[PDB]
DNA sequence: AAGGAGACACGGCTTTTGCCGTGTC
């Protein structure tokens, strides 16, 4: 299968590098024949040799445009005719552009942007990711030594572990006695060693767990200060370290470096991501951390190193299996998008769209719009709406089914046949018109999106027909895998229609999705009260909770599916609701606010975790009892009780002051600080004393009673004596846990008066 | 091997029915 292309300048001349794996063999096609292009739109066909004759310098060399050739395409259903502009090299693109774009013969220019290597996948109508192949697999991390406000990479890398089919592994440069750990004599050694294990078994993936932000620029700068040529790739090389806008994003030539922290960052919802809190939500149980401080300790003691070693082996063998189930799913969106998978798995489904589009405008010789100017972005960052809003029921509800709208909206766009060129066309048979909003669609041909979808909702029904044909749950997993990624393709439609980036951006499709929405979504709700007795406790955007007052589990259960049937079968052509679970209790607190329990006690909120940087354990605490007491045992006195008991134990200062220490981190010089917060105020005024204060320093702090800014009372929990100080027990209420917990309980009623003291 | 550019609430300040500067997930 492909893996990944790239190109090589050779000669001044592209090119064009394809990664394969074919039955167990690594091997690198080439193409010296892809020529670059962009396109131009000009007022007349004439003018053609003023510019095919344009020139622009860029490093010494002069560029021209190797050749001009008039091809006609659609733009936007309608027939376009377009200038397609040769070149040499990728790279003369951006050089050459802004200049033919100014001369005054030409209108516009399309398609510039599109880089090289991906252009390549598209236009050979090559596809990433298909195929039988076993691609060989190995998860890796390494453990550091940690002092707070050293310079990145300061302290040595103490153990690189690594996982895979065969177990998992440690290599160290310490005498520590398990079977599975290599010792050798240094640091130096023991990424040798690591890099001659990567060599030797060959692996298609890499798989780190923010190995893009951490692992390889750790190792990159260690291996630096001890001269060792860091080499991962296949074809000799080391990790290419690059800036994706925001964050870095590391590469490993041959090879698919899965960083496993962006795609489950994206999959679910969590307060944290820290690796034991990922490995737990997914499978189970949780995973004993070892922390830094903890670390440094049995290394420089020596005592307690044996634990330290099955935190590392751990480390590995968890991150090879959260591998194993996220790579099947980011294998699936790459061979639907046509797009390596080191791309797809780091993209935003916005993006996802866009390259699926780009990729499917070219299979239908359709010229793809640009992105928006500057001016036209704002233009459109302005005209921004939601989705289905609607009030809550207050109140703790029982036996609590969810169901799902996202796959309504794309049914819709096929149904209504919404998109841009059937948008308002003039002089057709048949219209189809937005609820409310007006817009017209035009009936008479598919349109482009619509045309897509289809195809992706029909395939997405093959694969769940088969997997009703299959009683074997490895393959009926893998089928599995197909059949949720289409869904999470198709359902990315219309949150792309109305996203201000877009190329195929369009206000109207994306207010006529959300139109006939209301609509279906309101016939749902209607339907599923009178017709079933549900009373429907909360909808948003992408779905409800419902339950029938008083009925029991096994009830709404079986009325629930009964529903699905009827709503599925009554709503129009391909709409259709989905069941996405169902929770033993749950309550719901505004339009955008709630929390329920599943049938196995995990309880999951939205919008109601502490989400500050400043926050405190007596706060968080307080919050998690309280949901405890309210989803876990339905006893709203008892949070109540809970509440009321920490206000007052904090006021008559009973409550150990470790539990109101905040935690807040230093990011630069404090010179350079343009404002100055508490942790700032602390840290500046230790620092005025002389004190070691770099970037990395983790300021550690309690508020004290007294008057004016929070600054002025803050002191180092170091100077805190418990005989003398006195903590703001009216800052650790009124700041820190009532607004924690105010939201929560005044949903059943209760003001933050009755929970004072 | 190529260009990209987010959401969200804190404390504090010649905005307690805002605009920064900030730095987490
Ligand atoms: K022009
Ligand atoms: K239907
Ligand atoms: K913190």
């Keep these: 299968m492909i893996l990944d292309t790239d190109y090589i300048t050779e000669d001044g001349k592209p090119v064009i590098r394809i990664f394969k794996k074919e039955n167990g063999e690594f091997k690198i096609d080439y193409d010296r024949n892809f020529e670059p292009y962009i396109y131009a739109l000009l007022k007349d066909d004439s003018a053609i040799e003023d510019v095919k004759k344009i020139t622009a310098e860029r490093h010494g060399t002069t560029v021209r445009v190797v050749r001009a050739e008039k091809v006609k395409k659609k733009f936007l259903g309608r027939p376009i005719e377009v200038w397609k502009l040769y070149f040499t090299h990728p790279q003369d693109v951006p050089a050459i552009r802004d200049k033919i774009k100014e001369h005054p013969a030409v209108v516009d220019i399309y398609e510039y942007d599109i880089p090289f290597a991906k252009r390549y996948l598209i236009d050979k109508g090559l596809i990433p990711m298909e195929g039988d192949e076993e691609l060989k697999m190995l998860a890796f991390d390494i453990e550091t030594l940690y002092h707070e406000g050293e310079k990145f990479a300061e302290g040595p890398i103490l153990m690189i572990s690594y996982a895979d089919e065969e177990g998992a592994r440690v290599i160290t440069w310490r005498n520590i006695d398990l079977p599975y750990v290599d010792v050798v004599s240094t640091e ?65 030539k041959g090879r698919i470096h899965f960083d496993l922290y962006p795609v489950i960052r994206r999959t679910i919802n969590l307060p944290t991501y820290t690796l034991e809190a990922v490995y737990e939500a997914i499978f189970g149980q949780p995973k004993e951390k070892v922390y830094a401080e903890e670390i440094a300790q049995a290394w420089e003691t020596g005592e307690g190193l044996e634990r330290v070693a099955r935190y590392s082996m751990e480390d590995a063998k968890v991150t090879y299996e959260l591998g194993k189930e996220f790579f099947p799913m980011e294998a699936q969106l790459s061979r639907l998008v046509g797009q390596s998978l080191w791309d797809v798995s780091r993209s935003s489904t916005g993006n996802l769209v866009e390259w699926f589009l780009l990729r499917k405008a070219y299979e ?31 109140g703790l509800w029982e036996n609590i089914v969810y169901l799902d709208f996202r796959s309504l909206y794309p049914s819709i766009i096929i149904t209504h046949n919404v998109s841009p060129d059937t948008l308002n066309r003039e002089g057709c048979e048949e219209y189809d018109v937005a609820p409310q909003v007006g817009h017209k669609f035009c009936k008479d041909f598919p349109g482009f999106i619509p045309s897509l979808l289809g195809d992706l909702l029909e395939e997405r029904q093959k694969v769940k027909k088969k ?31 109305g996203y201000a980036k877009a190329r195929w951006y369009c206000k109207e499709c994306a207010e006529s999705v959300t139109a006939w929405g209301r609509q279906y979504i309101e016939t749902t709700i209607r339907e599923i009260e009178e017709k079933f007795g549900f009373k429907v406790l909360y909808a948003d955007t992408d779905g409800f909770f419902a339950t029938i007052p008083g009925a029991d589990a096994e009830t709404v259960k079986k009325k629930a599916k009964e529903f699905l049937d009827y709503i599925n079968a009554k709503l129009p052509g391909l709409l259709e609701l989905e069941y996405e679970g169902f929770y033993k209790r749950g309550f719901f607190v505004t ?57 007052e134990k904090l006021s008559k200062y009973e409550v150990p ?100 003291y």
């Design 364 to 394: 239908r010789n359709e010229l793809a719009p640009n992105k928006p100017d500057e001016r036209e972005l704002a233009r459109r960052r302005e005209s921004y709406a939601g989705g289905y809003v609607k009030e809550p029921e207050r």
């Design 591 to 647: 339009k955008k606010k709630y929390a329920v329990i599943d049938e196995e006690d995990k309880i999951t909120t939205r919008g109601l975790e502490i989400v500050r940087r400043d926050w405190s354990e007596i706060a968080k605490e307080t919050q998690a009892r309280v949901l405890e007491a309210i989803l876990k045992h339905g006893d709203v006195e008892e949070a109540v009780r809970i509440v009321k008991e920490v206000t």
């Design 188 to 252: 130096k050694e023991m990424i040798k060693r690591f890099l001659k294990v990567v060599k030797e078994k060959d692996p298609d993936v890499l798989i780190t767990y923010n190995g893009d932000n951490f692992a390889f620029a750790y190792l990159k700068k260690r291996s630096e200060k001890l001269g060792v040529k860091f080499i991962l790739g296949r074809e000799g090389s080391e990790p290419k370290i690059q800036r994706m806008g925001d964050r870095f994003a590391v590469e490993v």
């Design 467 to 497: 997997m009703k044909a299959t009683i074997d749950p490895i393959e009926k997993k893998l089928l599995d895998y197909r059949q949720r990624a289409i869904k999470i393709l198709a359902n990315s439609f219309y949150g792309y229609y």
């Design 657 to 756: 002051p470790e539990k109101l220490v905040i935690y807040e981190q230093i990011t630069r010089d404090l010179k350079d600080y343009k404002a100055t917060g508490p942790h700032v105020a602390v840290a500046k005024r230790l620092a005025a004393r002389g004190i070691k204060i770099r970037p990395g320093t983790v300021i550690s702090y309690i508020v004290l009673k007294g008057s004016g800014r929070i600054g002025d009372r803050a002191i180092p929990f170091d100077e805190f004596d418990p005989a003398k100080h006195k903590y703001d027990a009216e800052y650790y209420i009124e700041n820190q846990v009532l607004p924690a917990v105010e939201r929560i309980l005044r949903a059943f009623g209760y003001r933050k008066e009755d929970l004072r």
